[PDB]
């Protein structure tokens, strides 16, 4: 609360005094918290007075902070220039005070390495992180960034090694423990991740840690995703997750993720209207949680609001993922299938298969959409020969896929008995396809019968023309 | 000096849903208890 009064006093001072570098810097140091543009403007103003009246080069700290603000904004090029200038300035004026400037350069160097990570120069970032760690083995963040980069590469053992190395320096480091727990949970190792996050809650300084409690409740949330016959076990897990989320909401009333967790549990409980209300509230609060968009789209589908669901899925996919996430793509395909746009559903499932051709569920879904499209065309008695032949070819493809999937498939996701029955239905549809193709051929000969009559009449018109000509 | 942390990243800027969400949860619990 006092930071706003300090801002007001400093703003009042700056307006009264156009030339006060310290007031501008003081104002900037509090605008950083919530006003990136305002802090940037204040730092720029301070730099202008330093160059104009003072006629001195900017301090490295101001350049580092300007670069960090640009990094927060997204101007990576300006951030790189400012970080390099800050390193250069700290080096240049190191003789005046080597001890202080060495530490300033250490922080600026870490910033530049983080930027290189942002610019996808992971080799330079890794080399810089290692250079920092070589001289300052107690910089935990460098260990964690190397582990994060290793995890981003996909080398989870290397990531865990870097994370363990960070824990070596700082035995109780909540971020390092969170990173190790996240690694374990991402691998679906529930016990290890649970222990790593409960360890944090065992510590006195983090007795009630919102991040750790949310992860612990998310562990019980993930158990509802897989259907289970045991009703009591599922219901108790729902209650456990809800209790953790409620406690986090009590401790923090602005927690978006506690609210989203409550909505997800409510939706898994079947209360789609209440979950929609929670999601809409959370959605008003922010638009930068992709799970909120996906949960809202799921509720739309459950409420038969297919127009909104398809747009939400497509928009979420476009905004939150640079690559293709086959799970969201499958969600979009299901939404289109419910809406009845089978051609768009087929195209979406083919797009999924393009990226994940080994997915057996995608193959089963493609076969189902092909059978439905072919059956719809065959039932239509106004279809021409070309469409009927294409439907016949598509029925054959579906029959082959269903038989192959029945021979080998992923039993944990879909039952092969259903695939076998689908294969039989495709075979029966093909058996009737002979009559259908005969029907189409007779239809298109009648098409040419009328065409001749059209030509016949036009010739009579020409005959009148000759009568006119003569 | 860093501003964004693992606790403030889970928080909304200002909006509070504690009252509305707990009211909604009370109604769900009330309806659940009423049914038998």
């Amino acid at each position: 609360e006092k930071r706003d009064i300090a801002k007001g006093h400093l703003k009042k001072v700056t307006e009264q005094y156009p030339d006060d570098v310290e007031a501008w810097i003081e104002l900037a140091q509090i605008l950083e918290q919530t006003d990136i543009q305002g802090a940037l403007s204040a730092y720029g103003t301070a730099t202008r007075i330093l160059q104009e009246k003072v006629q001195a080069d900017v301090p490295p700290e101001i350049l580092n902070n300007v670069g960090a603000l640009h990094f927060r904004l997204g101007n990576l090029g300006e951030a790189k220039k400012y970080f390099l200038a800050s390193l250069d300035r700290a080096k240049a004026e190191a003789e005046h005070d080597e001890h202080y400037y060495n530490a300033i350069s250490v922080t600026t160097s870490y910033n530049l390495a983080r930027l290189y990570e942002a610019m996808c120069e992971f080799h330079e970032a890794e080399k810089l992180y290692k250079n920092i760690l070589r001289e300052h083995p107690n910089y935990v963040d460098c260990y964690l960034r190397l582990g994060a980069m290793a995890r981003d590469k996909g080398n989870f053992y290397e990531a865990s090694d870097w994370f363990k190395e960070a824990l070596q320096i700082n035995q109780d480091h909540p971020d390092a423990w969170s990173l190790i727990g996240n690694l374990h949970l991402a691998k679906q190792e529930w016990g290890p991740g649970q222990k790593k996050f409960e360890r944090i809650l065992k510590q006195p300084s983090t007795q009630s840690d919102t991040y750790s409690m949310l992860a612990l409740g998310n562990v019980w949330l993930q158990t509802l995703h897989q259907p289970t016959r045991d009703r009591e076990k599922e219901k108790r897990h729902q209650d456990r997750a809800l209790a953790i989320y409620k406690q986090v909401l009590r401790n923090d009333a602005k927690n978006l993720y506690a609210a989203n967790g409550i909505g997800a549990v409510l939706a898994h409980k079947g209360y789609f209207r209440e979950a929609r209300d929670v999601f809409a509230q959370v959605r008003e609060a922010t638009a930068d949680i992709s799970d909120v968009w996906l949960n809202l789209a799921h509720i739309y589908v459950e409420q038969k609001q297919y127009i909104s669901a398809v747009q939400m899925y497509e928009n979420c996919l476009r905004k939150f993922y640079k690559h293709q996430n086959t799970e969201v793509v499958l969600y979009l395909a299901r939404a289109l299938f419910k809406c009845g746009k089978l051609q768009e559903c087929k195209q979406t499932l083919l797009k999924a298969r393009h990226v994940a051709p080994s997915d057996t569920v995608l193959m089963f879904n493609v076969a189902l959409v092909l059978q439905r499209l072919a059956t719809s065309v065959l039932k239509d008695e106004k279809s021409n020969l070309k469409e009927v032949l294409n439907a016949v070819k598509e029925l054959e493809l579906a029959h082959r896929y269903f038989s192959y999937l029945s021979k080998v498939g992923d039993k944990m996701r879909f039952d092969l008995a259903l695939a076998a029955t689908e294969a039989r239905q495709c075979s029966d549809l093909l058996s009737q396809a002979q009559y259908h193709v005969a029907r189409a051929r007779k239809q298109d000969e009648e098409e040419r019968e009328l065409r001749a009559k059209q030509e016949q009449e036009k010739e009579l018109l020409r005959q009148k023309l000759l009568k006119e000509q003569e | 000096r860093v501003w964004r942390t693992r606790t403030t990243i889970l928080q909304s800027t200002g909006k509070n849903f504690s009252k509305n969400i707990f009211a909604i949860l009370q109604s769900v619990k009330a309806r659940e208890e009423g049914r038998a």
Partner: peptide, 24 residues
């Protein structure tokens, strides 16, 4: 009783630990 095979999951995935540039 036939439809697209897709299990709808209501997910609440926490964000990654922030590592923004540090201010001096």
């Amino acid at each position: 009783r036939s439809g697209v095979v897709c299990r709808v999951k209501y997910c609440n995935s926490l964000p990654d630990i922030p590592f923004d540039p540090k201010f001096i």
